[PDB]
Ligand binder design. Structure first.
Ligand SMILES: CCCCCCCCCCCC(=O)O[C@H](CCCCCCCCCCC)CC(=O)N[C@H]1[C@@H](Oc2oc(CO)c(OC(=O)C[C@@H](CCCCCCCCCCC)OC(=O)CCCCCCCCCCC)c(=O)c2OC)O[C@H](CO)[C@@H](OP(=O)(O)O)[C@@H]1O
Ligand SMILES: CCCCCCCCCCCC(=O)O[C@H](CCCCCCCCCCC)CC(=O)N[C@H]1[C@@H](Oc2oc(CO)c(OC(=O)C[C@@H](CCCCCCCCCCC)OC(=O)CCCCCCCCCCC)c(=O)c2OC)O[C@H](CO)[C@@H](OP(=O)(O)O)[C@@H]1O
Ligand SMILES: *[C@@H]1O[C@H](CO)[C@@H](O[C@@H]2O[C@H](CO)[C@@H](O[C@@H]3O[C@H](CO)[C@@H](O)[C@H](O)[C@@H]3O)[C@H](O)[C@H]2NC(C)=O)[C@H](O)[C@H]1NC(C)=O
Ligand SMILES: *[C@@H]1O[C@H](CO)[C@@H](O[C@@H]2O[C@H](CO)[C@@H](O[C@@H]3O[C@H](CO)[C@@H](O)[C@H](O)[C@@H]3O)[C@H](O)[C@H]2NC(C)=O)[C@H](O)[C@H]1NC(C)=O
Ligand SMILES: *[C@@H]1O[C@H](CO)[C@@H](O[C@@H]2O[C@H](CO)[C@@H](O[C@@H]3O[C@H](CO)[C@@H](O)[C@H](O)[C@@H]3O)[C@H](O)[C@H]2NC(C)=O)[C@H](O)[C@H]1NC(C)=O
Ligand SMILES: *[C@@H]1O[C@H](CO)[C@@H](O[C@@H]2O[C@H](CO)[C@@H](O[C@@H]3O[C@H](CO)[C@@H](O)[C@H](O)[C@@H]3O)[C@H](O)[C@H]2NC(C)=O)[C@H](O)[C@H]1NC(C)=O
Ligand code: 0IL
Ligand code: 0IL
Ligand SMILES: *[C@@H]1O[C@H](CO)[C@@H](O[C@@H]2O[C@H](CO)[C@@H](O)[C@H](O)[C@H]2NC(C)=O)[C@H](O)[C@H]1NC(C)=O
Ligand SMILES: *[C@@H]1O[C@H](CO)[C@@H](O[C@@H]2O[C@H](CO)[C@@H](O)[C@H](O)[C@H]2NC(C)=O)[C@H](O)[C@H]1NC(C)=O
Ligand code: NAG
Ligand code: NAG
Ligand code: NAG
Ligand code: NAG
Ligand code: NAG
Ligand code: NAG
Lengths: 140, 601, 140, 601
């Protein structure tokens, strides 16, 4: 596979690759580069879907240096009158947005944290895409 | 066949297959052909002939430059077109020539410039028309709309529209009958001359995040005069820029219209008073709020006439105090802020729903906490902690009730369900309770559905509590860590049909407790550890039984009690999955199906 | 045994007898006679203990027309600086008090409710006395 | 012997035996004779001679009329007298004649009239003197107190005392060294002339329910000037009449004294402000409240100097907000009113206890919720609902921690105990949790005690989580519905001694998981259902093992796997109660002890 780099910080080396056979490109950026200590910034995303990203949601499979975790389920937008603007688009329509984020309050030890993302959408509820993240962490 | 057949001889899809022309080897009488991401730099006359019958088409991101005349000619029954993403620099006039029955049409991201240079004048029965994300300048409806009929939606949002004029919508005056769910959002606009919307009648109108400051909003609301809409929606979107300030001065004068529903969505400001705000939004027969953070307001109580109310994903400091004289339904779900509860007074109310909030109670249930006299439905699931200190007194007409995944207290100290003599549904599941008082189900003489899964029992022995429930049919009790049953518990329950007893810890099986149940069909013993019976006195089951799980549990394969295996293989006409009954207790006999093996001794 | 009557109401016929072998007399009165529907009144008690009624408490065995209940445990006064005045007395010292009570909010059906009282006290925690109550109930 | 012997040759009690004179047949060298409810209408000289050695006596409600001279003559070492209830109309002078070593004396309900007509002038080393419920009029201390020394208590409460005068306590001025825990309660009194209490030093003083109105209390507090007490107690009793009104006007001027502790008990009024009340009760090195209902107060925060605080059985509307600059201990238990929590700022604090309140949390644990930096103890048991959203960050010095019988949430989503690297005690019991993440105990490198009973496991299989805990000795995990164990779980735990594994659901027994544990002494398998072993590979246990429950479970007595019974009866030097191991699976072999029976085949 190919290696998609994103950014570097004092204690972060985020990167990602594809998981499944479909390889529809995508573009992601974060500023400033995350520090695994509680940060705040913006996230720019540019994409061109292939299914109706309506009532989308996420499944998350986490791995802390070879120790699995339960499966996380995040509902992005649901039903009618959603908070986000982009999740009423259709096939072929370009999505190009930026969203703000921030967190703080947990200590993470050294390791090779790894995550598995699954986006589900559509009225028949098919998968949309899938990626594999890699995050090193070496506190100073 | 490179194009994938997903359903034979009716639907054939194929996307991203690097084609350059329409595939023909597909069957003749095919419908709803999909075609996406296949570069077709230009379309030719009669491009679609080998498919005389066709319901749905699609050309999504198939890079198109020019569609010429005569297209879709040899084509009827085509009800849907999707021309998304294809940058069309020249739509040939006369296109869409022969389309007898078309209803939906979608043209998004197509670089249009106006609406009158759009050749649908011969059309009819067209219901929806979505045209968004384009480059349009004026909201001047063309004239062929007079010819148009049965149009329902017209969704032109996120364009470069700037203002309106009374000359617009001079057409559509001459429509005695009309339903139009118009819509326009995300439009940068700053002025409407008065009188534009006048004597018109819509059925919806959505304006979210199309203003830049408060005074602009005041002027624009002044621009609306006499709209008479049946449903209005305001607010903004989180993803982009929003407003900075919001008070009673804003949104005023909105009651020069004639509205009957309202919906504000996602304010980003910390509003602080709801009275004298929303002030003349009375007589509105519905009301709702979504994702608004009014974290500090004192007097929620007032006299509005609201027959329906919704508070979804809001935030709060206190639980609101309500005093409404005619409010027939309430829905207070998914909120986050406060964790308490208080008294309300709703003298004529017939529906509650307080779910997933996470709040707490004390002295839970009585007619003095809701001030009503006839409450038909009630749901209290997924909250924090409830305490019972009064059996439901004054609520003699209540037919639905749920408590699952809450945390109950003091449930076994007295008859908690004693006045409800007309009840049908009841669910107490995964509440951390402990049944230790025979007769806790005293007084319920009409129950038919009963659910309790995950509720321990005193010393793990089932007592005789199922009496006077002479209509029960669906009885659920599983994952309750039972270890034995009373000899005569299921008596007089002559109407049961479903009986779930899975995932417990049994060791013996006996047919005596279920001797006289003349209506059973399903019987469930799945995730137990059954090794044998008390003895071979295993009688016949009631004839009506026709379904019986006995799977997913470890057996012991030794010639000891081989008569038990003889008895189970004696009646195979009631098992389910004979391949998943296998023993593993003896090391040799492992994974081998039971009914297959034959034993010595 | 002997029958000790107390009072009568429209729907109450309270009475009591001794349970165990010790038969140290006692005098109890309630005004007005309880109605098993939620009432309010005063309770006059005169007694002469035989042990130090210090850190006293109560065990209760209830019976609803032949259906038992769990065992109830009531701490009357405990430790130091107690709410009640009488529970610092000693042996031989007469206790003579009156206490107010009130309740409402539960419906009880017909039956023959019966209760078992056990008073425990003292630094070695011995029993003090024991009684058996009988309460009929016939709503109008 | 009618008089019951409860302990031979030292203590002999007999009450209610209808005697009329002292029993003599009792042994000679007897101590602490009890004698109660035996009518002795009059006592005679030398009534007690056959008991030359005697520690304790008692004459309780033994109806006495007159005690003459010479009593207790041939009697030493007698340290206690209890003359309760006996109505004495004439105490003969010279009584209590020869008493070399007496320390305690009790005379209650004896119809006394004063204190100087009380013949204890020759006494010494008398420590306590309780004289209550009498009929006394004046609080005029007699003069022989000058002779008296080492007196500690003087408890004269519930009498008919009316007022005080400076002439009183003119004695006790000439006591350079003195500890007196004086007390007087329930006294109907209404006036004290000023200057009475002056240059005196007590060690306690209790005045509960001895005033009838507020102005009387103000005057009486004005009556105290310069007391310099080490502990003061005020309030009332619920059983009787109390006060009607209470504000900052009351209790004022109380800071003309020099106090160091305070204790108000059971106000019956709904006090509403605590600031500018208790105002000059600062510098008091302790503070406490019991059974007070301040149900509405807003600013609990202020700057007092209080080094110790207690709020026991109070009531509240809000959780109090605190800001104290030097408060080393807090105790907030058994409260009832509110169910929430908020932030506090206690910059120098070393003890918490929030038990049995029933309140709730959110974002439970971090150094920003308590503002401190060194917190050594912490207890949060018996509350409503706790949610974990931050591993304990900033609390790197914490040695005690408990959570039992709470309701935890989200405990298995990340390393919750990750910064506490010096911890010894930890208890998570009967919290409705679900361990499903290996490594939840990551970072705790000093734990020695670990308790968890009643906490389910994922699919009922023990994972390998016990690593890096290289000091653990007492491991508790029972009532957790286990069904099997990992093959290598208890490794590197080379310091365990206790191991509780009772009340689970096992079927097989194996010695392999406990192969290398060189420090075990106790091993518990009590309330399981063990029928056999996986096979007869049952190895030796580690030599150090000397205690092993194997009782209270049903066995199967058939000659199948008789080698198992051979193996268990092979080592009886480690069982406990051989009489309670008996099988009941075969109908014939029932209730018969196992090691007794011998089997064929
Ligand atoms: C793509 C990587 C895979 C996912 C990584 C973990 C995602 C976990 C999903 C749940 C997170 C969540 O609930 O939201 C929010 C943090 C957002 C996550 C960050 C975006 C990731 C960007 C990925 C692309 C960039 C490359 C937490 C939250 O609670 N939000 C609500 C709350 O916000 C409000 O109060 C909270 C209280 O804590 C704080 O939070 C904090 O700062 C800490 C917070 C999160 C700690 C975990 C953060 C994981 C970061 C991962 C780094 C990415 C590297 C690739 O504490 C917690 O909430 C703990 C909850 C349990 C977390 C378990 C995760 C452990 C996985 C470890 C994997 C290495 C906020 O700052 C903020 O305070 C200002 O409250 C508001 C309301 O006030 C609420 O808004 P709402 O009421 O309208 O819903 C927020 O939703
Ligand atoms: C000797 C008979 C054997 C005992 C009989 C049952 C006793 C049960 C013990 C627990 C009762 C208790 O908790 O106290 C109080 C009622 C006092 C009991 C009556 C005295 C009996 C006299 C016996 C000699 C006379 C012959 C209830 C209580 O909750 N008190 C606190 C509370 O008071 C406050 O708010 C409550 C909220 O309900 C109401 O209560 C009510 O009116 C109803 C209340 C009690 C209902 C059961 C009453 C049983 C009466 C028995 C009749 C005697 C016939 C012989 O509801 C409940 O609390 C239900 C709790 C579960 C009850 C199970 C009992 C079922 C047994 C049935 C046997 C036939 C009060 O009126 C009052 O509102 C004004 O709150 C205050 C604080 O606000 C609190 O004070 P505190 O905070 O300082 O502690 C009270 O303690
Ligand atoms: C009695 O109650 C139990 C509740 O525990 C009912 O059980 C459930 O049975 C279904 C059907 O097998 C289970 O679904 C399964 O999930 C797996 C994994 O996703 C999937 O591969 C299977 O195809 C199936 O969908 C389900 O997990 C199980 N438990 C629950 C909580 O639903 C049972 O059906 C009831 N019996 C009767 C007769 O109603
Ligand atoms: C033996 O146990 C299995 C489960 O362990 C039983 O499976 C069947 O389970 C499915 C899953 O819940 C039931 O499904 C249908 O599920 C939908 C879910 O939304 C529900 O809405 C429908 O009302 C319907 O219940 C299925 O009904 C259930 N089977 C039966 C007969 O009800 C299996 O049935 C058990 N064996 C026998 C003989 O029942
Ligand atoms: C392992 O943990 C269990 C906790 O379940 C410890 O058990 C307890 O054992 C005692 C001693 O037998 C039980 O007390 C008994 O109560 C009865 C009834 O009052 C009384 O007649 C007996 O004389 C005895 O006092 C107690 O009920 C039982 N359970 C609990 C929750 O305490 C067990 O001791 C622990 N094992 C080791 C080795 O520490
Ligand atoms: C077999 O199981 C029984 C219980 O089922 C074990 O009993 C022993 O239980 C008692 C009751 O808890 C323990 O008591 C002492 O209890 C007091 C209670 O306050 C506690 O404070 C003391 O620290 C002490 O633990 C007793 O210690 C316990 N036995 C032992 C040896 O610890 C019985 O011990 C089990 N068999 C074996 C061989 O341990
Ligand atoms: C093409 C469309 C795809 C858009 C997906 C972009 C979403 C990323 C941030 C959106 C939420 C901002 C984080 C946030 O704070 O909100 C949380 C919600 C938590 C959801 C966390 C999901 C993490 C998914 C990472 C995706 C990596 C590719 C609620 C609270 O807080
Ligand atoms: C010689 C000394 C004996 C004195 C015993 C007299 C106590 C009777 C009333 C005292 C409490 C008043 C009831 C009450 O309301 O307070 C409850 C406390 C509940 C305790 C209920 C115990 C019931 C015992 C019945 C005894 C029948 C003989 C707390 C709340 O409420
Ligand atoms: C971003 O960080 C990563 C991780 O530290 C860097 O990758 C390593 O890079 C160093 C320096 O080139 C090498 O010596 C290591 O062998 C690399 N290890 C791995 C696992 O890749 C990366 O170079 C950094 N990016 C930049 C631009 O410096
Ligand atoms: C108090 O009430 C009880 C119960 O109703 C009365 O007892 C019964 O009394 C009637 C009338 O004398 C008799 O006919 C019944 O046979 C009695 N039954 C029992 C079980 O005792 C009692 O008489 C009432 N007290 C007074 C003074 O009228
Ligand atoms: C997304 O929109 C921004 C808006 O200015 C634009 O600058 C950017 O180029 C767009 N993304 C792409 C991939 O063109
Ligand atoms: C449009 O309005 C008419 C008015 O009678 C109504 O019957 C119809 O249901 C409306 N359309 C939709 C889709 O509801
Ligand atoms: C339900 O119960 C009621 C009363 O117990 C009875 O009259 C009725 O026949 C039962 N069955 C149905 C179907 O209502
Ligand atoms: C208890 O005290 C009251 C107080 O007036 C008195 O009337 C009553 O007689 C006393 N009780 C007895 C049994 O004397
Ligand atoms: C009495 O006071 C002295 C003063 O030093 C003190 O040592 C002693 O402990 C006090 N008595 C008691 C019982 O505490
Ligand atoms: C406890 O653990 C620490 C560190 O893990 C270690 O240094 C020490 O020797 C262990 N034992 C004792 C008794 O402290």
């Amino acid at each position: 596979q190919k290696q998609y780099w994103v950014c570097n910080s004092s204690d972060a080396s985020i990167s990602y690759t594809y998981c499944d056979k479909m390889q529809y490109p995508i573009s992601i950026n974060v500023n400033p580069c995350i520090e695994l200590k509680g940060s705040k910034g913006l996230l720019h995303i540019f994409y061109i879907p292939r299914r109706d990203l309506k009532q989308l949601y996420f499944n998350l499979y986490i791995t802390v240096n070879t120790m699995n975790l339960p499966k996380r389920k995040e509902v992005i937008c649901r039903g009618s009158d959603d908070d986000y603007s982009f999740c009423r688009a259709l096939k072929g329509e370009t999505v190009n947005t930026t969203i703000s984020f921030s967190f703080k309050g947990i200590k993470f030890s050294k390791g090779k944290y790894k995550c598995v993302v699954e986006a589900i959408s559509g009225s028949p509820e098919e998968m949309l895409f899938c990626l594999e993240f890699v995050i090193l962490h070496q506190p100073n | 066949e490179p194009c994938v057949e997903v359903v034979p001889n009716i639907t054939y899809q194929c996307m991203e297959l690097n084609f350059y022309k329409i595939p023909d080897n597909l069957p003749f009488s095919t419908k709803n052909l999909d075609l996406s991401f296949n570069p077709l730099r230009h379309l030719g006359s009669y491009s679609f002939f080998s498919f005389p019958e066709l319901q749905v088409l699609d050309l999504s991101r198939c890079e198109i430059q020019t569609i010429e005349d005569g297209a879709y000619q040899s084509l009827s029954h085509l009800s849907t077109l999707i021309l998304t993403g294809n940058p069309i620099q020249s739509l040939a006039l006369g296109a869409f020539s022969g389309l007898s029955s078309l209803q939906k049409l979608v043209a998004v991201e197509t670089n249009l410039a106006s609406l009158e240079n759009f050749p649908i004048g011969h059309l009819k029965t067209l219901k929806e028309l979505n045209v968004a994300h384009n480059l349009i300048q004026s909201f001047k409806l063309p004239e062929y709309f007079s010819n148009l009929t049965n149009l329902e939606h017209l969704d032109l949002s996120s364009n470069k529209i700037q203002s309106i004029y009374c000359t617009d919508l001079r057409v559509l005056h001459q429509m005695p009958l009309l339903n139009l769910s118009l819509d326009l959002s995300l439009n940068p606009m700053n002025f409407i001359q008065p009188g534009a919307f006048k004597e018109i009648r819509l059925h919806k109108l959505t304006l979210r995040n199309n203003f830049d400051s408060l005074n602009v909003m005041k002027t624009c609301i002044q621009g609306l005069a006499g709209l008479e809409v049946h449903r209005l929606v305001l607010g903004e979107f989180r993803n982009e820029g929003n407003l900075e300030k919001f008070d009673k001065s804003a949104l005023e004068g909105l009651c020069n219209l004639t509205i009957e529903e309202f919906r504000l969505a996602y304010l980003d400001y910390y509003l602080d008073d709801i009275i004298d705000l929303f002030n003349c939004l009375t007589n509105v027969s519905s009301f709702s709020l979504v994702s608004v953070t009014i974290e500090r307001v004192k007097d929620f109580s007032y006299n509005f006439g609201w027959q329906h109310l919704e508070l979804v994903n809001c935030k709060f400091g206190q639980f609101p105090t309500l005093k409404l004289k005619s409010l027939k339904r309430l829905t207070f779900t998914s909120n986050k802020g406060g964790n308490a509860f208080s008294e309300v007074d709703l003298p004529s109310l017939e529906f509650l729903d307080l779910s997933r909030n996470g709040l707490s109670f004390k002295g839970c249930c009585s007619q003095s906490d809701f001030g009503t006299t006839s409450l038909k439905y009630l749901d209290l699931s997924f909250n924090g902690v409830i305490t019972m200190s009064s059996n439901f007194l004054g609520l003699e007409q209540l037919e639905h009730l749920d408590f699952q995944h809450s945390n109950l207290k003091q449930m076994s100290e007295f008859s908690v369900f004693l006045s409800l003599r007309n009840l049908i549904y009841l669910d107490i599941s995964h509440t951390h309770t402990r049944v230790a008082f025979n007769g806790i189900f005293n007084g319920l003489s009409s129950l038919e559905v009963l659910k309790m899964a995950g509720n321990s029992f005193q010393e793990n022995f089932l007592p005789d509590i199922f009496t006077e429930l002479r209509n029960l049919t669906f009885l659920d009790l599983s994952q309750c860590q039972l270890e034995q049953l009373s000899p005569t518990a299921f008596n007089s329950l002559s109407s049961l049909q479903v009986l779930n007893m899975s995932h417990n810890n049994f060791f013996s099986l006996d047919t005596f407790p279920y001797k006289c149940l003349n209506s059973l069909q399903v019987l469930d013993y799945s995730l137990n550890h059954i090794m044998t019976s008390k003895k071979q006195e295993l009688q016949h089951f009631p004839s009506s039984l026709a379904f019986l799980n006995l799977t997913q549990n470890d057996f012991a394969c030794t010639c000891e009690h081989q008569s038990f295996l003889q008895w189970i293989k004696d009646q195979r006409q009631l098992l389910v999955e004979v391949e998943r009954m296998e023993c593993a207790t003896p090391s040799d006999k492992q994974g081998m199906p039971v009914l297959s093996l034959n034993i010595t001794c």
